[PDB]
From Swiss-Prot:
Subcellular location: Periplasm
Residues of the full protein shown: 42 to 251 of 251
Phylogenetic classification of the source organism: Bacteria, Bacillati, Actinomycetota, Actinomycetes, Mycobacteriales
GO molecular function: acyltransferase activity; peptidoglycan L,D-transpeptidase activity
Entry's Gene Ontology BP terms: cell wall organization; peptidoglycan-protein cross-linking; regulation of cell shape
EC number: 2.3.2.-
Gene that this sequence comes from: ldtA
The keyword Cell wall biogenesis/degradation appears for this protein: yes
Pathway noted in the entry: Cell wall biogenesis; peptidoglycan biosynthesis
Protein name: L,D-transpeptidase 1
């Protein structure tokens, strides 16, 4: 079960618990205004449908075990593929709309709805680790700085960028990294 206890997270953060409709019924999310959601599939997650409510305490009851977490501010960053931007807002007001490189004209960032999964100060990225030569046009060996993970699939917040990853300036990527906590909503759109 994730979220873990007390964990201060964000409002696109899924509820994650490890006949599907059977265990789907032993799970219930208790929210102040009865926040709804749907299921997604082993391992199933429950996700709130219009983000969470900000600064709301969330309770999760699964079998005889019940664990809870609190949401901080609502920080949303949006990656527009037409405009070449990653816009960041915190509770209503955009703070900093930063120009972003979202992949490359071959494999641009996949449009969709996500959370900030992890924060890694520097992470080295080696394409040889899953089978891509470094002389390939989609080949690389790089040490990323201020890396905020977007997906399990390896998309990151951290130009002819690969994997569809998102590339910001060093000054811009520092701020998002300091301002962000896991769970912080991530939206790729047009």
């Amino acid at each position: 079960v994730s979220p873990a206890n007390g964990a201060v997270v964000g409002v696109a953060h899924p509820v994650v618990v490890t006949d599907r409709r059977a265990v789907e019924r032993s799970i219930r999310i208790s929210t102040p205004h009865n926040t709804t959601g749907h299921f997604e599939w082993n391992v199933v997650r429950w996700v709130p449908h219009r983000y969470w409510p900000p600064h709301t305490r969330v309770s999760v009851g699964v079998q005889e075990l019940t664990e809870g977490f609190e949401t901080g501010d609502a920080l949303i960053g949006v990656a527009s593929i037409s405009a070449h931007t990653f816009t960041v807002s915190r509770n209503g007001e955009v703070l900093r709309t930063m120009p972003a490189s979202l992949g490359k004209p071959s494999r641009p960032t996949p449009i969709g709805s996500f959370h900030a999964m992890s924060k890694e100060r520097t992470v080295v990225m080696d394409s040889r680790t899953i089978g891509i030569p470094l002389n390939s046009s989609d080949g690389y060996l790089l040490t990323a700085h201020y890396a905020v993970r977007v997906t399990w699939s390896g998309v990151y917040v951290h130009a002819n960028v690969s994997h569809g990853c998102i590339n910001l300036s060093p000054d811009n990527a520092a701020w998002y990294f300091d301002a962000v906590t896991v769970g912080d909503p991530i939206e790729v759109v047009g």
